[PDB]
Amino acid sequence: RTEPLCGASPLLVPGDPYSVVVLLQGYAEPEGVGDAVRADGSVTLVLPQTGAEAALEEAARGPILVDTGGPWAREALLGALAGQGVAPGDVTLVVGTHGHSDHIGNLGLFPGAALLVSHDFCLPGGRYLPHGLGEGQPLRLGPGLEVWATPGHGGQRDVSVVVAGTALGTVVVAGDVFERDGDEDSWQALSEDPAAQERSRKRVLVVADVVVPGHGPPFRVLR
Amino acid sequence: RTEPLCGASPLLVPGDPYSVVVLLQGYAEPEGVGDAVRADGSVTLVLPQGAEAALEEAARGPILVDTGGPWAREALLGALAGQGVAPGDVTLVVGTHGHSDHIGNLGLFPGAALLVSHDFCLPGGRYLPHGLGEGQPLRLGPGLEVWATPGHGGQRDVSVVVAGTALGTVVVAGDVFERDGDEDSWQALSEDPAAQERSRKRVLVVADVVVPGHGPPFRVL
Ligand SMILES: [Fe+3]
Ligand SMILES: [Fe+3]
Ligand SMILES: [Fe+3]
Ligand SMILES: [Fe+3]
């Protein structure tokens, strides 16, 4: 069973060593007539408490942003960050779950951050460092903090961020692996590779107590 | 065969009704030791002299094809200004695929329509559906088309084809071509080598000039 996670906005999930704050909740709204959709992706902040393998671990010692929204969301992102006491210049790592325009629209706000966009990792300045991310080999960012390969939606190189040890248990920031709570009958049409995405969805639901989907509010996973 | 395209920088290909200017030439440089690579994507400006209608309207002003990584912001702004273009003047941004060194500065152009891979949205994030496919290009204008060129980034990569320039047909190919002479290097970087080879052949049939993702433009002879 799953229930949308209600509570004070922005949704803050305290934890140790990492807290998670959903800065902007995603949406995807159809229109009264025609087939257009107004949408934007969720943006999540992972906050540490108060070759490529080592660089990732170092870049994760500061604020980590998971997705950035579309370009139109720039002022709202800046405001949300400020609300958490974080200047754009303070962000040390940006993770882009996949390369769609409503998820990676504001990378340029963070020229001082390391960037992990899908499976490509670079230091600030565009020095790309190879690594071995795969479905059987997650990337360790820190204690109880990992990047998973969760292919399917955007293609074979989508990633998710898994945050263990919060007050609500394990939070998975899943990109569009999940569209929203109750997307059981809608996600397949949006998917590049439904078979892969199904494997990824099942994998996430084994570990997650909370899922932050790409286009809706976070939800709890019950057992 | 192919040959590097020589001339004055920035590389300007005049034409009618569209001119093409390579604002920033991409590169991907290995290091003296270890396996790291410093890279950035080519950025091209196409200048005029439901979704189908929106696309034609958005292509009536300056069109940017890719944007470079986030570290390239000031260089991109400078190059645009050198062409008399303010960022606010750009009416359409085309992202060939979603890698960080191609779509790193989308946020500079909030007033532009965006076509990143197969997703088209008006400014503000209103996404409009369309029928782009390998057998169904999107028409932007006279002799200006977006092609579906899958392979490198995945199944939804796109390329911009500009007919009628002084040098003939210019294809802005994203990473469909890494660089002139990439014959034995592109495969390792490809998410679907079968699709990418299909796309490379398609492009080479029509192109007189290719702007690849990580090198200078080259002529096709
Ligand atoms: Fe999305
Ligand atoms: Fe998506
Ligand atoms: Fe590239
Ligand atoms: Fe690429």
Author numbering:
A (entry chain D): 5 to 54, 70 to 242
B (entry chain C): 5 to 53, 70 to 241
Verbatim from the authors:
Here, we report evidence that MBLAC1 is a nuclease specific for cleavage of RD histone pre-mRNA. Crystallographic and biochemical studies show that MBLAC1 has an overall MBL fold and di-zinc ion containing active site related to that of CPSF73, but which has distinctive structural features involving active site flanking loops and the absence of the β-CASP domain, which is only present in CPSF73. The combined biochemical, cellular, and genetic analyses presented here provide clear evidence that MBLAC1 is an endoribonuclease selective for 3' end processing of RD histone pre-mRNA during S-phase of the cell cycle.
To investigate its function, we solved a crystal structure of MBLAC1 (1.8 Å resolution, space group P1). MBLAC1 has four of the five characteristic MBL-metal-binding motifs, His116, His118 Asp120 and His121 (motif II), His196 (motif III), Asp221 (motif IV) and His263 (motif V) (using BBL numbering) with two waters completing metal coordination. In the structure of recombinant MBLAC1 produced in E. coli, the active site was refined with two iron ions present. However, MBLAC1 produced in HEK293 cells preferentially binds zinc ions. Four MBLAC1 molecules (chains A-D) are present in the crystallographic asymmetric unit; analysis of interactions at the crystallographically observed monomer interfaces identified interactions between chains A-B and C-D possibly reflecting dimeric MBLAC1 in solution. The metal containing active site is adjacent to the dimer interface, rationalizing reduced dimerization as manifested by metal ligand substitution or metal removal. However, although there is low overall sequence similarity (27%), the overall MBLAC1 fold is structurally similar to the human endoribonuclease β-lactamase-like-protein 2 (LACTB2), RMSD 2.23 Å over 153 Cα atoms, an endoribonuclease responsible for mitochondrial mRNA maturation. Comparison of the MBLAC1 and LACTB2 active sites reveals very similar di-metal ion binding modes and proximate active site residues.
